[PDB]
Amino acid sequence: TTDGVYRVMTRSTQVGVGVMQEGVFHTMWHVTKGAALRSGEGRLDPYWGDVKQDLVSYCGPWKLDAAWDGLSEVQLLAVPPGERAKNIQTLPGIFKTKDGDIGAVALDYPAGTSGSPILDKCGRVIGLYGNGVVIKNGSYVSAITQGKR
Amino acid sequence: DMYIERAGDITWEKDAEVTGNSPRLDVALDESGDFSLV
């Protein structure tokens, strides 16, 4: 119910993370594949999602609209399986694409951290962690994936 | 069948560890949602 960051479990194992804001649960498509979720005794049903963006929202439309300003450091609020939530600050790089630049964080956390929020200095969620690339040395870089509100 | 459990408040931490580089990478995004390096 409450706003905050949540683990997504399969009954049990943590397969991802998401954000509750304004009554809507936000995670990455690859975490749930649009399957329904349980929250206590209640059920959350998918409302909106997009495979190409790798995003899904439950119980309402996508609510997170803050954007990286292209200049400032950000914080990954990483929620790794089996570990407490922790903040890691970084200066994003960028994914240069044919459709514009996307901020990208060179931070490597396990599969089940997918959906962890990335924050600006005001604590607003500027996107979700966990859709990325592997560079030549094996290192990972995640897009700052944000939906449209 | 999957379920959610609260893990924390969404806040910036003043003390936070700072790490990671800032790469500028040429990337493509396919219709399946996979990024790849060009």
């Binding site: 990455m28 690859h30 396990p110 599969a111 966990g130 859709n131 990325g132 690339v133 592997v134 | -």
Partner: peptide, 6 residues
């Protein structure tokens, strides 16, 4: 990463 890039 570790389900590949996810």
């Amino acid at each position: 990463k570790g389900x590949x890039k996810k």
